[PDB]
UniProtKB/Swiss-Prot annotation, chain A:
Component of the translation initiation factor 2B (eIF2B) complex which is a heterodecamer of two sets of five different subunits: alpha, beta, gamma, delta and epsilon. Subunits alpha, beta and delta comprise a regulatory subcomplex and subunits epsilon and gamma comprise a catalytic subcomplex. Within the complex, the hexameric regulatory complex resides at the center, with the two heterodimeric catalytic subcomplexes bound on opposite sides. It comes from Schizosaccharomyces pombe (strain 972 / ATCC 24843) (Fission yeast). Belongs to the eIF-2B gamma/epsilon subunits family. The lineage of its organism: Eukaryota, Fungi, Dikarya, Ascomycota, Taphrinomycotina. It is found in: Cytoplasm, Cytosol. Coiled coil: none annotated. Acts as a component of the translation initiation factor 2B (eIF2B) complex, which catalyzes the exchange of GDP for GTP on the eukaryotic initiation factor 2 (eIF2) complex gamma subunit. Its guanine nucleotide exchange factor activity is repressed when bound to eIF2 complex phosphorylated on the alpha subunit, thereby limiting the amount of methionyl-initiator methionine tRNA available to the ribosome and consequently global translation is repressed. This is Translation initiation factor eIF2B subunit epsilon.
UniProtKB/Swiss-Prot annotation, chain B:
GO terms for molecular function: guanyl-nucleotide exchange factor activity; translation initiation factor activity. Transmembrane segments: none annotated. It comes from Schizosaccharomyces pombe (strain 972 / ATCC 24843) (Fission yeast). One of its GO terms (biological process) is cytoplasmic translational initiation. This is Translation initiation factor eIF2B subunit alpha. The chain holds residues 15 to 171 of 341 of the full protein. The lineage of its organism: Eukaryota, Fungi, Dikarya, Ascomycota, Taphrinomycotina.
Length: 214, 157
């Protein structure tokens, strides 16, 4: 209600909406005020705050749970379309014959995919390109990302405009930033976040880790 | 003069084999109509009748052939009229006759633009032997990059 902002100037100590505010009302600190809840029992509602949410939410979005807000609705003039087992393709996207797509996958437009490669449970941005005879599972790819021939990905985040050479590999929980590149015949361990500047994390631009530091 | 028009029909096969038979006959009839110094309406239709049958009797009495020829006539004579200038007849004939064959040989393409979406990704098609139209649609589909694979009936005899 319109009292709240003024009611926040007063009682300036309140900084978190759930921690400080609600407790203040219920403890009668802030007096004579009441609150309520609207326990929803249908449709869908959630917010994005944690990695264990993003991956979760995305796997709920593709699972139709927030219809009409779906890729195949294309609210921003995208060219998506539903296919069985919850795989979502756009238009003008090339797929090799030997390349196969398993369930719960999504492909942006203008994105190529190499041969004999397998993608599953994965989300891929637009205008990407995938190497040949690679393996991707439960990963997340954004726009303008590339992939070298014969590589293993899984349960990791690849930022936009990220380049990965051939013969590379990467395991779960990993995170990269934009512009980061990794040279061929390489590997990256778990949960190792990267960046393009040594603000606080590790990694640099061109060649693998253990290289280009600083 | 215009004689053994089958060779015109026939030379078309060497001039172009990728076109079917009835289109060649049509291409020959208009050619026959082109070099037909005629003077009466009856003369025209008497020619192509005693022309098409000679063309008809020459090839197995084939259906697709006998289809087009008989259809060709009953097209041209439809919106036919004679007024003052007799040359208008031969004018209206060949001009509309050209329009037919023009629309004719272009049909086998128009079909492809309609049949290609009938093939889905990873679909499985079946076809009894060779069939002109069936080829083009599948090709014009494969050009658009779609995964599938077909069986083929050997089609005895």
């Amino acid at each position: 209600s319109n009292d709240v902002p003024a009611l926040f100037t007063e009682n300036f100590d309140y900084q978190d909406i759930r921690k400080d505010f609600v407790y203040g009302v219920l403890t009668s600190d802030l007096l004579g005020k009441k609150i309520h809840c609207h326990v929803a029992k249908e449709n869908y509602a959630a917010r994005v705050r944690s990695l264990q949410t993003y991956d979760a939410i995305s796997k709920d979005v593709l699972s139709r749970w927030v219809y009409p807000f779906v890729p195949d609705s294309n609210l921003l003039n995208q060219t998506f379309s539903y296919q069985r087992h919850q795989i979502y393709k756009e238009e003008d996207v090339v797929l090799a014959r030997s390349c196969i797509i398993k369930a719960r996958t999504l492909i942006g437009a203008y994105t190529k995919v190499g041969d004999a490669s397998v993608v599953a449970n994965t989300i891929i941005g637009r205008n990407c390109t995938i190497g040949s005879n690679c393996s991707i599972d439960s990963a997340f790819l954004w726009e303008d990302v590339v992939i070298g021939d014969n590589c293993r990905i899984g349960k990791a985040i690849l930022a936009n405009s990220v380049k990965i050479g051939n013969n590379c590999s990467i395991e779960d929980g990993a995170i990269v930033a934009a512009g980061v590149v990794i040279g061929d015949n390489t590997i990256i361990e778990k949960n190792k976040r990267l960046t393009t500047f040594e603000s606080h994390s590790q990694g640099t631009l061109n060649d693998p880790s253990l290289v280009g530091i600083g | 003069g215009e004689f053994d028009i089958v060779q015109v029909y026939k030379k078309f096969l060497q001039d172009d084999p990728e076109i079917t038979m009835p289109v060649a006959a049509i291409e020959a009839l208009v050619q026959l109509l082109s070099r037909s110094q005629a003077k009466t309406i009856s003369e025209f239709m008497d020619i192509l009748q005693n022309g098409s049958n000679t063309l008809k009797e020459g090839v197995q009495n084939n259906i697709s052939l006998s289809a087009g020829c008989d259809i060709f006539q009953r097209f041209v004579t439809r919106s036919l009229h004679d007024v003052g200038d007799f040359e208008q007849c031969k004018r209206h004939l060949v001009e509309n006759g050209k329009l037919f064959i023009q629309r004719a040989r272009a049909c086998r393409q128009r079909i492809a633009h309609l049949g290609y979406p009938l093939i889905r990704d990873g679909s499985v098609i079946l076809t009894h032997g060779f069939s002109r139209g069936v080829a083009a649609v599948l090709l014009a589909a494969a050009k658009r990059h779609v995964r599938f694979k077909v069986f083929v009936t050997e089609s005895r005899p």
